[PDB]
Amino acid sequence: GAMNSSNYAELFNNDIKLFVDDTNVYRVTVHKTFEGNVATKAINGCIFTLNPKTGHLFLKIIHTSVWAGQKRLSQLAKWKTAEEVSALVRSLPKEEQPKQIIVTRKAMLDPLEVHMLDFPNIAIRPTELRLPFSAAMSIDKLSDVVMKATEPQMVLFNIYDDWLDRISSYTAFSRLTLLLRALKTNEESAKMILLSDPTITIKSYHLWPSFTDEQWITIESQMRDLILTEYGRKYNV
Amino acid sequence: MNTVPFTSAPIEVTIGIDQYSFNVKENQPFHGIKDIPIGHVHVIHFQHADNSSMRYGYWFDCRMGNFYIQYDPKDGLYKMMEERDGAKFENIVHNFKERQMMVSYPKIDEDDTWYNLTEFVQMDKIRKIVRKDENQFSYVDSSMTTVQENELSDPAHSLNYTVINFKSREAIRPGHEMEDFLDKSYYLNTVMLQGIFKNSSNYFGELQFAFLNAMFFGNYGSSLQWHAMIELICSSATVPKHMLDKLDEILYYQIKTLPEQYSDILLNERVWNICLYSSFQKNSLHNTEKIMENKYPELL
Numbered sequence: 441g442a443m444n445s446s447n448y449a450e451l452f453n454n455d456i457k458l459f460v461d462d463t464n465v466y467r468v469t470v471h472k473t474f475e476g477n478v479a480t481k482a483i484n485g486c487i488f489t490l491n492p493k494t495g496h497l498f499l500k501i502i503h504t505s506v507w508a509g510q511k512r513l514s515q516l517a518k519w520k521t522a523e524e525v526s527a528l529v530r531s532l533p534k535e536e537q538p539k540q541i542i543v544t545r546k547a548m549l550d551p552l553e554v555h556m557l558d559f560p561n562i563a564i565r566p567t568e569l570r571l572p573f574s575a576a577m578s579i580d581k582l583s584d585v586v587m588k589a590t591e592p593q594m595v596l597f598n599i600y601d602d603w604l605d606r607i608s609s610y611t612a613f614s615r616l617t618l619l620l621r622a623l624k625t626n627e628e629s630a631k632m633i634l635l636s637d638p639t640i641t642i643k644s645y646h647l648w649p650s651f652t653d654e655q656w657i658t659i660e661s662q663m664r665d666l667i668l669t670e671y672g673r674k675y676n677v
Numbered sequence: 678m679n680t681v682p683f684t685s686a687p688i689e690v691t692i693g694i695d696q697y698s699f700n701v702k703e704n705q706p707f708h709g710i711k712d713i714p715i716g717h718v719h720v721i722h723f724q725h726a727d728n729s730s731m732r733y734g735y736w737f738d739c740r741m742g743n744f745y746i747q748y749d750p751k752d753g754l755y756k757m758m759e760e761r762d763g764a765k766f767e768n769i770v771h772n773f774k775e776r777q778m779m780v781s782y783p784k785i786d787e788d789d790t791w792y793n794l795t796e797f798v799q800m801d802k803i804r805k806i807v808r809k810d811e812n813q814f815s816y817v818d819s820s821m822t823t824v825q826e827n828e829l830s831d832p833a834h835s836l837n838y839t840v841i842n843f844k845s846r847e848a849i850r851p852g853h854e855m856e857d858f859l860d861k862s863y864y865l866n867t868v869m870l871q872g873i874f875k876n877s878s879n880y881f882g883e884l885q886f887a888f889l890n891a892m893f894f895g896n897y898g899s900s901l902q903w904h905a906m907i908e909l910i911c912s913s914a915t916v917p918k919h920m921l922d923k924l925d926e927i928l929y930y931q932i933k934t935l936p937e938q939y940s941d942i943l944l945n946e947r948v949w950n951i952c953l954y955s956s957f958q959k960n961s962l963h964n965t966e967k968i969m970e971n972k973y974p975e976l977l
């Protein structure tokens with residue numbers, strides 16, 4: 441059924457699965473027209489597809505040309521997401537097809553179910569977890585590839601870099617979600633924390649700096665402090 | 678006018694004939710129903726006084742044979758049988774009539790209700806939904822499941838309604854997923870009407886039969902089918918103008934006939950609010966919307 445805190449370790453078993461987040465597929469800036477009305481201008485977006493066990497991020501880049509002459513774009517964006525996820529499953533061999541796809545927003549259930557009718561054995565599930573994947577566009581190299589794209593494209597990032605060599609995927613996912621929650625809550629401060637020290641330098645192939653085990657403990661603590669700080673600022677606590 | 682004689686009435690029972698009903702007391706001198714209008718299918722149905730479990734009954738057309746009812750004390754129910762000896766049958770009926778042992782089908786001359794509820798229902802099509810080929814009449818009861826329900830248990834005893842499933846490969850063309858899911862016109866017009874039913878009359882006949890089995894037997898799967906067939910039309914942007922006007926009339930008479938006190942179990946709030954207020958046809962069912970808003974405004 442749905443995915444929540446009780447069956448949480450299922451995310452890290454050996455049944456291949458992906459998280460699909462559509463919150464950055466259809467992105468707009470709102471502005472005033474010369475006549476004083478309001479209009480939107482689309483900008484490039486992306487589909488965030490993550491294998492939580494391996495850390496691979498299969499980012500589809502959604503180029504603004506896909507919206508040209510279309511209506512009801514917020515609704516279309518859900519069906520375009522489902523179409524692209526189905527097409528990635530279709531491309532893969534039988535032994536790489538995911539046994540489950542977990543959508544971060546319930547509005548994706550029917551579009552994905554309908555596009556995946558050919559795959560009755562793949563479970564399409566919602567989640568009770570509030571995951572901060574919308575902040576993926578705060579990771580500089582992901583935002584750069586999306587905004588520079590001149591055409592549709594799907595680009596591989598490794599959101600756990602080489603962490604799996606040293607930690608389990610349960611721990612890696614916890615670290616990712618803490619980093620993304622912090623970037624969502626106060627992006628400037630989170631990036632300040634991540635980059636303050638110019639000597640542990642985020643390597644050319646990396647998103648996340650090459651922190652030692654001890655430095656990650658310190659970073660993770662500083663991110664918790666940022667989240668707690670912002671919570672206090674928000675609610676006057 | 679035709680007759681369905683009863684051998685006897687050994688157990689106390691509420692007997693329905695189409696939209697009418699009456700009580701028969703244990704061993705009361707009751708020998709059946711006369712003056713049944715020729716030209717329509719009919720249903721004669723039963724609910725035992727001592728065990729309201731199992732409503733059951735029989736769909737029949739008096740033009741297709743001479744039918745009577747006889748209680749079976751072994752299987753414990755009133756059974757429909759056909760009499761092949763026509764002279765015997767006429768002779769029995771005439772005696773019961775002369776002794777005034779029969780209730781009269783109480784049709785008011787002004788009243789077209791039964792016609793309006795069965796306009797498209799034909800005995801030949803009932804016998805394809807209800808499979809028992811050795812009889813000319815069809816038994817239905819409150820517990821019989823539909824073929825679709827059995828996909829989700831005896832098949833000889835199923836209601837073989839046409840399966841409707843909005844998230845099925847039959848409903849959705851590869852490459853037209855959003856289009857076909859948000860606008861059911863393909864499923865309705867090409868798959869169902871051209872492909873399976875052939876015409877809108879056969880579609881409406883199954884819809885009307887499903888409603889009547891839901892109402893008269895409390896058959897849950899029939900209620901599901903009735904709502905599915907309504908939603909399929911209302912959720913299609915492209916429906917022939919004559920189908921919409923006829924659907925409005927069909928539904929009007931169904932809502933008009935429904936017992937007010939069964940409204941809570943026979944009407945799906947989601948389906949009706951979607952159909953009347955959100956669907957493509959939200960403005961095409963004026964008569965139905967008017968009776969629904971005046972009779973069942975709670976549901977909405």
Ligand SMILES: CCN(CC)C(=O)c1ccc(B(O)O)cc1
Binds near residue numbers: 456491494496536537
């Ligand atoms: C569903 C997309 N794919 C295929 C690219 C995966 O999720 C995947 C499957 C298996 C491995 B593995 O080496 O165990 C890594 C990644």
